[PDB]
């Protein structure tokens, strides 16, 4: 009976609100349902009512979630993709679509950064652009998401592809740019950057180095 009630309730909520605030209404229901599930039922039914709740409220409308999550992820919606993940976490086949789409988002975000390579500062700009993408997106997986290895591997697979950008019949410049970054930093000539600050940048340089194919 709670399956049929949330089969009707799930279809009723989407017809009134968009997918952005659909998450809040559904999370406003599961949070309330978990409260009343422990006020009435036996403790052994907590993991079966909620599973029946999400099956008829999330896994049922799985196509609606995957179709619109493209707009959610590719807008850096912090407060909206957080609720998007927790609903798809429970469904077995819901989560693998979100990581794949984010893996494409990092690929497109990285290529946008690594396209206007100024010829006078090629190595420092390329390493910093990859570090800025990695340094900001690791926060998203650690602030509005949980540091799941599925997402972290999605980031690593995406950053591996964008760093090792192989043009047709042409060699990738990733080994040359990263190597030149080290040489441009260990030079005592021109302006130095002290002992402590140089090794700090080189410590973060390893993150870019690990994605070299």
Swiss-Prot record:
Coiled-coil boundaries: none
Residues with the N6-acetyllysine modification: 180
UniProt subunit comment: Component of multiple Cul2-RING (CRL2) E3 ubiquitin-protein ligase complexes consisting of CUL2, Elongin BC (ELOB and ELOC), RBX1 and a variable substrate-specific adapter; this complex is also known as ECS (Elongin BC-CUL2/5-SOCS-box protein) complex and may consist of CUL2 or CUL5. Component of a ECS(VHL) or CBC(VHL) complex containing CUL2, RBX1, ELOB, ELOC and VHL. Component of the ECS(MED8) complex with the probable substrate recognition component MED8.
Superkingdom of the organism of origin: Eukaryota
Localization per record: Nucleus
Post-translational modification, as annotated: Neddylated; which enhances the ubiquitination activity of ECS (Elongin BC-CUL2/5-SOCS-box protein) E3 ubiquitin-protein ligase complexes. Neddylation leads to structural rearrangment in the complex that allows interaction between the E2 ubiquitin-conjugating enzyme and the acceptor ubiquitin. CBC(VHL) complex formation seems to promote neddylation. Deneddylated via its interaction with the COP9 signalosome (CSN) complex.
Name of this protein: Cullin-2
Annotated organism of origin: Homo sapiens (Human)
Upper classification of the organism: Eukaryota, Metazoa, Chordata, Craniata, Vertebrata
Disulfide linkage: none
This protein's domain notes: The Cullin neddylation domain restrains the RING domain of RBX1 in the E3 ubiquitin-protein ligase complex; this restraint is removed upon neddylation of the cullin.
Free-text function comment from the UniProt entry: Core component of multiple cullin-RING-based ECS (ElonginB/C-CUL2/5-SOCS-box protein) E3 ubiquitin-protein ligase complexes, which mediate the ubiquitination of target proteins. CUL2 serves as a rigid scaffold in the complex and may contribute to catalysis through positioning of the substrate and the E2 ubiquitin-conjugating enzyme. The E3 ubiquitin-protein ligase activity of the complex is dependent on the neddylation of the cullin subunit and is inhibited by the association of the deneddylated cullin subunit with TIP120A/CAND1.
Family according to the record: Belongs to the cullin family.
């Amino acid at each position: 009976e709670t399956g049929e009630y949330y089969k009707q309730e799930a279809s009723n909520l989407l017809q009134e609100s968009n997918c952005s605030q659909y998450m809040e209404k559904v999370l406003g229901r599961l949070k309330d349902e978990e409260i009343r599930c422990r006020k009435y039922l036996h403790p052994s039914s907590y993991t079966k009512v909620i599973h029946e709740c999400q099956q008829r409220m999330v896994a049922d409308h799985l196509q609606f979630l995957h179709a619109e999550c493209h707009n959610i992820i590719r807008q850096e919606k912090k407060n909206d993709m957080a609720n998007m993940y927790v609903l798809l976490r429970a469904v077995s086949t819901g989560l693998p679509h979100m990581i794949q789409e984010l893996q494409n988002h990092i690929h497109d975000e990285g290529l946008r950064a690594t396209s206007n390579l100024t010829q006078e500062n090629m190595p420092t700009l390329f390493v910093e652009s990859v570090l800025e993408v990695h340094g900001k997106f690791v926060q998203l997986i650690n602030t509005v998401l949980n540091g799941d290895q599925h997402f972290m591997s999605a980031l690593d697979k995406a950053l591996t592809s964008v760093v090792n950008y192989r043009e047709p019949k042409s060699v990738c410049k990733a080994p040359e740019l990263l190597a030149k970054y080290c040489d441009n930093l260990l030079k005592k000539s021109a302006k130095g950057m002290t002992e402590n600050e140089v090794e700090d940048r080189l410590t973060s340089f390893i993150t870019v180095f690990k994605y070299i194919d």
